[PDB]
Design an enzyme around this catalytic site. Structure first.
Site, PDB file in Angstrom:
ATOM      1  N   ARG A   1      -0.729 -26.936 -13.148  1.00 18.09           N
ATOM      2  CA  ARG A   1       0.602 -26.351 -13.064  1.00 18.09           C
ATOM      3  C   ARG A   1       1.545 -27.159 -12.184  1.00 18.09           C
ATOM      4  NH1 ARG A   1      -2.941 -21.846 -13.337  1.00 18.09           N
ATOM      5  NH2 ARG A   1      -2.388 -20.451 -15.072  1.00 18.09           N
TER       6      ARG A   1
ATOM      7  N   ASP B   1      -6.934 -16.531 -21.584  1.00 22.02           N
ATOM      8  CA  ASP B   1      -6.525 -17.048 -20.287  1.00 22.02           C
ATOM      9  C   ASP B   1      -6.308 -15.974 -19.228  1.00 22.02           C
ATOM     10  OD1 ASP B   1      -4.353 -16.001 -21.558  1.00 22.02           O
ATOM     11  OD2 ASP B   1      -3.027 -17.723 -21.250  1.00 22.02           O
TER      12      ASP B   1
ATOM     13  N   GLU C   1      -9.529 -17.840 -14.640  1.00 25.21           N
ATOM     14  CA  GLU C   1      -8.358 -18.217 -15.431  1.00 25.21           C
ATOM     15  C   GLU C   1      -7.166 -17.457 -14.860  1.00 25.21           C
ATOM     16  OE1 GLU C   1      -8.345 -20.498 -17.888  1.00 25.21           O
ATOM     17  OE2 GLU C   1     -10.506 -20.879 -17.813  1.00 25.21           O
ATOM     18  N   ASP C   2      -6.578 -18.044 -13.810  1.00 23.17           N
ATOM     19  CA  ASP C   2      -5.465 -17.532 -13.005  1.00 23.17           C
ATOM     20  C   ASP C   2      -5.445 -16.010 -12.908  1.00 23.17           C
ATOM     21  OD1 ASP C   2      -4.381 -16.769 -15.513  1.00 23.17           O
ATOM     22  OD2 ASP C   2      -2.662 -18.093 -15.382  1.00 23.17           O
ATOM     23  N   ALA C   3      -6.610 -15.413 -12.678  1.00 23.06           N
ATOM     24  CA  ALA C   3      -6.704 -14.071 -12.129  1.00 23.06           C
ATOM     25  C   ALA C   3      -6.876 -14.149 -10.616  1.00 23.06           C
ATOM     26  CB  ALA C   3      -7.862 -13.306 -12.769  1.00 23.06           C
TER      27      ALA C   3
END
Ligand SMILES: [Zn+2]
Ligand SMILES: [Zn+2]
Ligand SMILES: [Zn+2]
Ligand SMILES: [Zn+2]
Lengths: 243, 50, 48, 49, 67, 400, 101, 33, 39, 45, 335
Positions: free
Chosen positions: F252, A24, F68-70
């Site tokens: 989220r 992730d 991916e939440d970078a």
């Protein structure tokens, strides 16, 4: 994996391979091993390479496909009201490669007033780019939503949305790309068909040709989220209050 | 020799006014309440039981 | 293809026996040394 | 409560079943050369392919 | 610590405006909003550099080792 | 998820923080108080010494390095000083007094060929203790130390042979980057036995791998550092500091960051800081009225161009300032590389511990994953050749 | 002269100079997108895009592909001769208005 | 020809440790539980 | 202590790449590999 | 030279070695080393 | 076609070029220099020092972006690159104080220096005509006057604030006669640089060199340099009566004004409408207004950091786009 030496300080890897590791990128870390014979250097590829393991041996479904941002990049292209002229298709068609693959342009859809292509003729070129590539497939798959037609006269293709997807001879004839045709889980995906009939090399050549495009493309188109498109329209607020 | 925690009324930091405490080069915004036994600075935690 | 940083690429070595096919490469690589990237860290002769 | 016990279950099942391979007569059998079943399933074909 | 000599996002200089923005507050008691518009900071990426600048240099200096 | 990470966000510590000598103390160069405050942070005086600074987030997908939440920040903002931390690390020695009345000595700078300093002593000074103000590299003794060789022998009550008995045992600066010496002091403890406490210093810049957050619990590895001219720009020329992808907010369900951006942008244009409290706070309908007078959109969602292609973007981008605190757990002190190193004594395997010069554990969960491939030659290579090889000669009959 | 510059990929070219693919060092989007506009106004070119392969290294790949009339290596040498003449109109017209003001 | 090619390829080849592949597919993340 | 090829008496423990080998500066033949630390 | 200084007295002490560890003018027992004169070479980025 | 980007309430439309032959059957608008030279016009609005404001008409949005990226990156300038410290006993640590010196603008223009060559060994690398050296020495002491306590620490201490003007330009040889008429100064000489208390001194010298902007953002000559496009509002039906004042408070206050004769809305001075799309919300102006943005009217706005006039860098950006496409007209194509 094979290697490539790059001058920063972290382990870069491709987007599609993060699905087996269920990684992730939020701070976690992974370790690498390098064998040091000549007979374990040869056996790590041909038994544990990532071309021979596009499929999981639990069920047989494909596990290495588009992750959660390559779907919604290759949906705004194949949206039914997305039309490109010649100079914009060419720029769009030259980011999926790096100026190496030879394309030959199919004749455009809209023809009399101006010359316009569609967002499927530019997506039926990343499968068979020219005559010398041997990929030709046939597939009939049902999308994630698939609102049904009048259910007796009109067949599955004539849905209200684009719906059911049709490809014949590596040209998209209907349907969109919404994780039922590209992504994981379902056995009848795009990347499963080239894997099944033409070896894994032609599958991996057509899988990273989507990722080089969908990286470069939608950062020049635009996509955001905010207050204005999460707030209720004041009829959903009036109706919820009593219901 | 009893150890005494900071900002208690037995230590020198009890009711100072940013001039005595500037002489002692200690922070005004520090919470206090922790021993400085031989270097490291430690804090007894509030246990609970039945 | 995984991408690897170069500070870990000149620690992790790989043994590589000399042959007539790769001899003209491995003479050019031992003279690079362990500070420029395509070099070596050690060497073991057949006598040694 | 699940993650530490699932890897406790994927290993208990692993150790009792770790060595069963299809011999050259299409016959999956144990390490002491004794028949478990004569074909893997009813027809002896790869479950992934 | 002290005010950053340039803005982080656009690039223009803010080092000659920290003493000015304060001098527009001691004398001529004035709004924080209308001060640094007169001063010359138009867009909303420079105005965060002086609104939110904590100035810890005046409190670190009282611990100088020279009595 | 934020309380477990608010205790890790680097920032400021106290007012006396350049006076203290602690084991490992992180500092940030230019911190800023947040834009959307709270009543809680002004009742403990948090904003009197804050931690982290508020960037100009333009939430959108960009170049595919934010999946991916970078997240994506620009190179020109880092050079202006966006998030340059600083790391201080104590180390100490004790000069020990023995039974036979022998001390320790700090003699230093042995010479060769008209020059006092060796490569190892360029920053060691005249008195033995390394010189405050100049850098050290790998090698380069910075506290010289000698320990006697009659460390435990009985005191001979005479004076016959005591003129050269000091063998060396210096302190070597390891580490993969050159760091500077900040301050070195010497004093004595409660019992009269001298102390040395030198405190190093290095500052660094946030290259990719360095883990940022959002104050609402959205971790992110820095993914790429692109130039300023490739970043987008609005009508006025405001280049965003950091781009985060849109694909967190559905899963989220963080509507705080969507409100924190509106209550923050409207505070900049009005010149006043705003409160976000719990069970209250600054409302929304009175905050779009400020945001429509100044000239922008009523939902903060501005429009802007692109820096690669030039023309407009076919959608609208949610644009504004968000407080991004920087966390710990950087990659300058997590890159590890062990080729062939120390080995433990009872097991003759590689040594566990990054500080013990590493070598990683191919366990039992990963051993069963190998045999499922059927691979039967690197299983022998990864578990006795590169790890634990040993040549035993065993007898044949009565075989042991 | 120099020869670590514009450079024809022999692996991805046709048997004549109709289709050709190049690799230009030291030059990013600022040329790579300006050259795309001035080339595609040729009535002979059918396909001219570019692509940056990787942002760690620094080299551009420009693609050029035309009909049977003129070779592509003669199309861009006409193309970047025609961006040179495009700046002469801009530099002249801008400088005679400053003096006027 | 292709319906008898895929059936002919799908037969389980000798040597595949179908024990080890089996143990990792089963173990993974009034009334009865 | 003594090499097998040059017979020098000075050895240099090299820790530049986390190998911690023991080798002389005369010829460059390692004296002991795989150190055994006192855990 | 410009040897050891004191903590709060801030008086420059050049103590003869292996004699004492206190300072004059004040009883304080913490001695800070003062900064060198030697040039040091930095970048500006 | 009709080169108007179409603003609506959730999208913009036809933002791309469509200015090339092979787009319709009647393959018009081929390249022709004389057909370009007539339609390209330039209109210079308010021009002073440290700011320019001017329009570029009828060029395609591909090459208007090419002039923005060159003013930020390619046009070279000067700033610090090596800071040499003497005794510093201030609370500001060294390579932070050496970093704030690098970002200070300088009023000396480039073309006075040459590009440094770092291939040479590092003692003739800094010659006499590619490097100017500037230094400062300053010490804080106690001011012996008689104010009372807690007053301004500008008169308890002399020179306790160091400013950008303290960088005394220290001219080396061969250039005492060349930089004599125009000495170098920091372009904004009131920048606060450090703070001092008595007993604390700062003494250093810097070697500022010639650098390219896209390497590090010390070197960039502009404050910021970007552009807009010209907004365009179309009115379909005549808004009359009470609604036209409601139609007026949903804009910036200059852009549309009431006809004082007959109560009808019309467009005043344009080019001030930032696109707040406020007329889309109200569902009574859903047909009366079709607003847009024309695709060939670039409102530039460049600024300078102080080194040179803003009409110089835009001359120098277009000058080096030509050389960027001239350098590879004259080099062979290696197979
Ligand atoms: Zn700004
Ligand atoms: Zn025996
Ligand atoms: Zn030897
Ligand atoms: Zn004293």
């Amino acid at each position: 994996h094979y290697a490539k030496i790059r001058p920063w300080r972290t382990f870069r890897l491709n987007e599609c391979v993060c699905t087996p590791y269920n990684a992730d990128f939020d701070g976690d870390e992974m370790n690498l091993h390098v064998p040091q014979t000549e007979e374990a250097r040869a056996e790590a590829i041909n038994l544990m390479g990532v071309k021979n393991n596009l499929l999981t041996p639990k069920s047989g479904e494909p596990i290495i496909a588009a992750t959660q941002d390559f779907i919604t990049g290759s949906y705004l292209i194949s949206h039914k009201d997305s039309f490109y002229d010649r100079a914009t298709l060419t720029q769009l068609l030259s980011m999926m490669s790096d100026g190496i693959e030879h394309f030959d342009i199919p004749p455009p859809a809209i023809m009399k007033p101006y010359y316009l292509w569609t967002g499927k003729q530019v997506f039926s070129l990343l499968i068979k780019p020219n005559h010398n590539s041997p990929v030709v497939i046939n597939l009939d798959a049902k999308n994630k939503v698939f609102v049904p037609p009048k259910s007796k006269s009109l067949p599955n293709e004539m849905s209200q949305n684009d719906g059911f997807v049709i490809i014949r001879g590596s040209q998209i004839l209907s349907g969109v790309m919404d994780k039922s045709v590209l992504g994981d889980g379902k056995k009848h995906s795009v990347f499963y068909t080239i894997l099944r009939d033409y070896g894994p090399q032609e599958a991996a050549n057509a899988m990273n040709r989507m990722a080089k495009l969908c990286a470069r493309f939608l950062g020049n188109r635009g996509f955001s989220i905010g207050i204005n498109d999460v707030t209720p329209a004041d009829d959903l607020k009036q109706k919820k209050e009593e219901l | 020799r009893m150890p005494i925690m900071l900002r208690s009324n037995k230590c020198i930091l009890y009711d100072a006014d940013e001039s005595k405490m500037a002489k002692l080069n200690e922070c005004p915004l520090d919470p206090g309440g922790y021993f400085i036994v031989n270097g490291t600075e430690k804090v007894i935690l509030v246990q609970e039981q039945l | 293809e995984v991408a690897v940083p170069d500070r870990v690429a000149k620690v992790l070595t790989y043994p590589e026996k000399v042959t007539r096919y790769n001899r003209h490469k491995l003479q050019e690589l031992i003279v690079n040394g362990p500070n420029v990237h395509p070099g070596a860290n050690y060497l073991l002769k057949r006598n040694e | 409560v699940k993650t530490a016990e699932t890897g406790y279950m994927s290993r208990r099942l692993m150790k009792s079943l770790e060595d069963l391979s299809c011999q050259y007569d299409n016959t999956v059998r144990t390490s002491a050369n004794g028949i478990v079943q004569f074909t893997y399933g009813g027809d002896g074909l790869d479950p992934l392919e | 610590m002290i005010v950053p000599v340039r803005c982080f996002s656009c690039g223009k200089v803010v080092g000659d405006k920290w003493e000015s923005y304060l001098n527009l507050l001691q004398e001529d008691e004035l709004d924080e909003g209308t001060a640094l518009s007169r001063l010359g900071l138009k867009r909303y990426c420079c105005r965060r550099m002086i609104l939110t600048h904590v100035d810890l240099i005046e409190k670190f200096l009282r611990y100088n080792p020279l009595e | 998820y934020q309380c477990a990470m608010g205790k890790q966000a680097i920032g400021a510590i106290a007012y006396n923080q350049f006076k203290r000598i602690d084991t490992l103390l992180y500092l940030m160069t230019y911190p800023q108080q947040p834009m959307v405050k709270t009543k809680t942070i002004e009742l403990i005086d948090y904003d009197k010494l804050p931690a982290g600074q508020n960037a100009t987030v333009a939430v959108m997908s960009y170049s595919g390095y934010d999946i991916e939440d970078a997240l994506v920040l620009n190179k020109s903002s880092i050079d202006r000083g966006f998030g340059r931390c600083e790391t201080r690390r104590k180390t100490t020695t004790v000069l020990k007094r023995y039974a036979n009345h022998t001390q320790d000595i700090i003699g230093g700078m042995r010479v060769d060929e008209n020059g006092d300093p060796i490569w190892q002593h360029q920053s060691l000074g005249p008195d033995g203790l390394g010189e405050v103000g100049m850098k050290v590299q790998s090698g380069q003794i910075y506290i010289n130390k000698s320990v006697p060789t009659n460390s435990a022998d009985a005191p001979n009550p005479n004076n016959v042979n005591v003129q050269t008995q000091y063998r060396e045992a210096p302190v070597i600066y390891r580490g993969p980057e050159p760091s500077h010496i900040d301050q070195v002091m010497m004093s004595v403890s409660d019992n009269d036995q001298a102390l040395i406490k030198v405190l190093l210093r290095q500052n660094r810049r946030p290259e990719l791998g360095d883990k940022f957050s959002s104050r609402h619990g959205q971790k992110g590895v820095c993914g790429i550092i692109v130039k300023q001219e490739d970043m987008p720009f609005n009508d006025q020329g405001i280049v965003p500091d950091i781009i985060m992808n849109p694909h967190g907010f559905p899963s989220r369900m963080t509507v705080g960051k969507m409100i924190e951006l509106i209550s923050g942008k409207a505070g900049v244009l009005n010149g006043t800081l705003e409160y976000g409290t719990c069970f209250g706070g600054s409302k929304l309908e009175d905050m779009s009225k400020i945001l429509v007078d100044q000239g922008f959109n009523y939902s903060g969602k501005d429009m802007l161009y692109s820096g690669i292609t030039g023309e407009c973007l076919q959608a609208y981008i949610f644009f504004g300032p968000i407080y991004y605190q920087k966390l710990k757990h950087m990659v300058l002190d997590k890159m590890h590389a062990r080729a062939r190193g120390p080995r433990a004594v009872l097991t003759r395997q590689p040594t566990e511990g990054r500080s013990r010069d590493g070598g990683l554990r191919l366990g039992e969960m990963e051993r069963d994953c190998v045999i499922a491939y059927g691979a039967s030659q690197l299983l022998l290579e990864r578990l006795m050749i590169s790890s634990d090889a040993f040549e035993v000669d065993v007898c044949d009959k009565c075989g042991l | 002269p120099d020869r670590e510059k514009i450079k024809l990929l022999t692996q991805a070219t046709s048997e004549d100079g109709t289709s050709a693919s190049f690799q230009i060092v030291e030059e990013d989007h600022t040329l790579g997108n300006a050259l795309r506009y001035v080339i595609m106004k040729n009535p002979d070119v059918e396909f001219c895009g570019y692509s940056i392969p990787h942002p760690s290294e620094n080299l551009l790949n420009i693609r050029i592909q035309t009909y049977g009339e003129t070779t592509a290596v003669d199309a861009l040498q006409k193309g970047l001769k025609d961006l040179m003449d495009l700046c002469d109109v801009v530099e002249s017209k801008f400088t005679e208005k400053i003096k006027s003001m | 020809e292709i319906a008898l090619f895929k059936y002919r390829k799908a037969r389980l080849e000798p040597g595949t440790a179908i024990g080890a592949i089996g143990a990792q597919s089963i173990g993974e993340p009034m009334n009865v539980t | 202590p003594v090499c097998k090829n040059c017979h020098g008496t000075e050895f240099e423990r090299d820790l530049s790449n986390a190998n911690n080998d023991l080798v002389c500066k005369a010829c460059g033949v390692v004296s002991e590999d795989n150190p055994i630390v006192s855990e | 030279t410009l040897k050891y200084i004191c903590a709060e007295c801030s008086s420059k002490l050049s103590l003869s070695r292996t004699d004492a560890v206190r300072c004059k003018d004040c009883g304080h027992r913490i001695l800070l080393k003062a900064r060198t004169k030697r040039l040091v070479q930095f970048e500006a980025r | 076609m009709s080169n108007i980007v179409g603003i609506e309430y959730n999208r913009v439309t036809n933002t791309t070029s469509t200015d090339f032959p092979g787009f319709s059957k009647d393959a018009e608008n081929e390249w022709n220099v004389e057909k370009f030279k007539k339609d390209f016009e330039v209109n210079i609005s308010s021009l002073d020092a440290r700011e320019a404001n001017f329009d570029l008409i009828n060029i395609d949005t591909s090459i208007a972006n090419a002039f923005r990226r060159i003013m930020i990156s390619e046009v070279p300038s000067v700033a610090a690159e090596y800071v040499y410290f003497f005794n510093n006993t201030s609370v500001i640590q060294d390579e932070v104080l050496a970093h704030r010196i690098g970002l200070v603008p300088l009023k000396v223009d480039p073309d006075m220096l040459t590009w440094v060559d770092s291939n040479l060994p590092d003692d003739e690398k800094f010659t006499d005509e590619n490097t100017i050296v500037l230094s400062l020495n300053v010490k804080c002491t106690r001011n012996p006057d008689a104010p009372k306590g807690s007053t301004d620490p500008k008169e308890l201490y002399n020179n306790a604030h160091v400013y950008a003007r303290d960088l005394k330009f220290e001219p080396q040889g061969r250039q005492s006669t060349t930089f004599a008429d125009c000495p170098v100064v920091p372009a904004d000489p009131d920048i606060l640089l450090a703070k001092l208390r008595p007993g604390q001194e700062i003494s250093l010298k810097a070697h500022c060199i010639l650098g390219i902007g896209g390497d590090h953002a010390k070197f960039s000559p502009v404050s910021t340099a970007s552009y807009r496009l010209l907004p365009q509002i179309n009115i379909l039906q005549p808004i009359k009566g009470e609604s036209a004042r409601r139609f007026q408070k949903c804009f910036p206050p200059g852009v549309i004004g009431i006809d004082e004769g007959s109560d009808e809305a019309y467009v005043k001075d344009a080019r001030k409408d930032t696109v707040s799309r406020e007329v889309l919300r109200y569902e009574e102006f859903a047909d009366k207004v079709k607003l847009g943005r024309v695709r060939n009217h670039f409102i530039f706005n460049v600024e300078s950091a102080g080194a040179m006039t803003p009409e110089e860098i835009f001359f120098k950006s277009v000058r080096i786009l030509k050389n960027k496409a001239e350098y590879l007209k004259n080099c062979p194509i290696t197979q």
